[PDB]
Design a binder for this molecule. Structure first.
Ligand SMILES: O[C@@H]1[C@@H](O)[C@@H](O)CO[C@H]1O
Length: 305
């Protein structure tokens, strides 16, 4: 009967696959169908709205490939009498200011990046690294606010704990994936032969994974690297390997809550003109490592090694 879309920029990430799964659960519970579409670029984004219109959908949840497409997405949706909810990446206008009137569901990005920095520091302490030969590699995607809030929160936490500001090195990545992060990390590694141990800061698991893979290629053993990702579900293949690596763990937020809650809220809005809150910040987070990832995922209903 009722058709609602769930559009995501990166279907290759377990993070979005999970949102899709829980959106389906919400459809089952409330009685609506979820049209799952990948929107990796702006063109596909706009064409997908047209497809949704053709299928008769009344609204959609979207994680845009580009926050700057916000105006256009809103324009096309108003044109088809569709309600829109943003999940994870906030829409911004042309000047980069947030489109506050579009309901948003997202993680507490600043708080989670601060936790990442706290946990990096703690593990560094446990390994007893001499600060003098250690450094932080921050792989940033500053044009994406949610990404920026995580890496800045993480760097601020490290500086608050006493990590030397001058030994915090930032390098921008061209893509939010392993290859982009790899490339960025490699260029930074060869510039710092004096560093014997590295803390890798990145907004999500893929970003940290690319950083870790680059350190391996420059001869660092796992004991000299500490990378803590963000997303959790995206690090299960790494945490499942026989051997420990420089990727120590990941902060697991709630993609399950994001998929179900944004879908539910869309539904209520469409079916009963029940207006969603403008901002829903989910604060859940748990650190998953090789030692507790299975238990923790099972514990969250994301069952499977
Ligand atoms: O791209 C990231 C995704 O990996 C997840 O962390 C949610 O926020 C998005 O910006």
């Amino acid at each position: 009967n009722l058709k609602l879309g769930f559009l995501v920029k990166q279907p290759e990430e377990p993070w979005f696959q999970t949102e899709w799964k829980f959106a389906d659960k919400a459809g089952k519970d409330l009685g609506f169908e979820v049209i799952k579409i990948a929107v990796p670029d702006g063109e596909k984004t706009l064409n997908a709205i047209d497809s949704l219109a053709a299928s008769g959908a009344k609204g959609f949840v979207i994680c845009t490939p580009d926050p700057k497409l916000g105006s256009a997405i809103v324009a096309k949706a108003r044109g088809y009498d569709m309600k829109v909810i943003a999940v994870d990446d906030q829409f911004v206008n042309a000047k980069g200011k947030p489109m506050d009137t579009v309901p948003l569901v997202m993680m507490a990005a600043t708080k989670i990046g601060e936790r990442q920095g706290q946990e990096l520091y703690k593990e560094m302490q446990k390994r007893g690294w001499d600060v003098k030969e250690s450094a932080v590699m921050a792989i940033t995607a500053n044009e994406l606010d949610t990404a920026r809030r995580r890496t800045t929160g993480s760097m601020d936490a490290l500086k608050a704990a006493g990590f030397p500001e001058k030994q915090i090195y930032q390098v921008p990545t061209k893509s939010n994936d392993i290859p982009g992060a790899f490339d960025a990390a490699n260029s930074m590694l060869v510039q710092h032969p004096e560093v014997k141990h590295w803390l890798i800061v990145g907004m999500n698991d893929s970003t940290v994974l690319g950083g870790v893979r680059a350190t391996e290629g420059q001869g660092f053993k796992a004991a000299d690297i500490i990378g803590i990702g963000i997303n959790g579900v995206d690090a299960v293949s790494e945490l499942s390997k026989a051997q420990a690596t420089g990727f120590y763990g990941s902060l697991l937020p709630s993609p399950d809550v994001h998929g179900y809650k944004s879908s539910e809220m869309l539904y209520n809005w469409v079916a009963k003109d029940v207006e969603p809150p403008k901002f829903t910040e989910v604060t859940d987070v748990v650190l998953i490592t090789r030692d507790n990832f299975k238990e923790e995922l099972e514990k969250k209903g994301l069952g499977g090694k």
